[PDB]
Design a protein around this ligand. Structure first.
Ligand code: CL
Ligand code: ZN
Ligand code: ZN
Ligand code: ZN
Ligand code: ZN
Lengths: 50, 49
């Protein structure tokens, strides 16, 4: 399943602009929510292209 | 900006399973492509996990 991520994509948790994609959660995250995700989970994830 | 994301991380070059992200190439690379990357370039990069 590929997915289109719009230019205005937003974090799945808060309202901030998305910066990361998690391959196992399948979700978009802002930097601050992403740092929490990395503390509590060990998932493959990547920065979004700027 | 506008881009496609996949459920699985695969190398941008060869489509094998990916292991690294390069911030300046903005690319996913498998281990073998990334070793080649390091031979030719010096960029900020991280493993995917
Ligand atoms: Cl992707
Ligand atoms: Zn995750
Ligand atoms: Zn967030
Ligand atoms: Zn490759
Ligand atoms: Zn690079």
């Amino acid at each position: 399943s590929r997915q289109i991520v719009d230019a205005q994509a937003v974090c799945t948790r808060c309202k901030e602009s998305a910066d990361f994609w998690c391959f196992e959660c399948e979700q978009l995250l802002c930097a601050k929510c992403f740092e929490a995700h990395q503390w509590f989970l060990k998932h493959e994830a990547r920065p979004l292209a700027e």
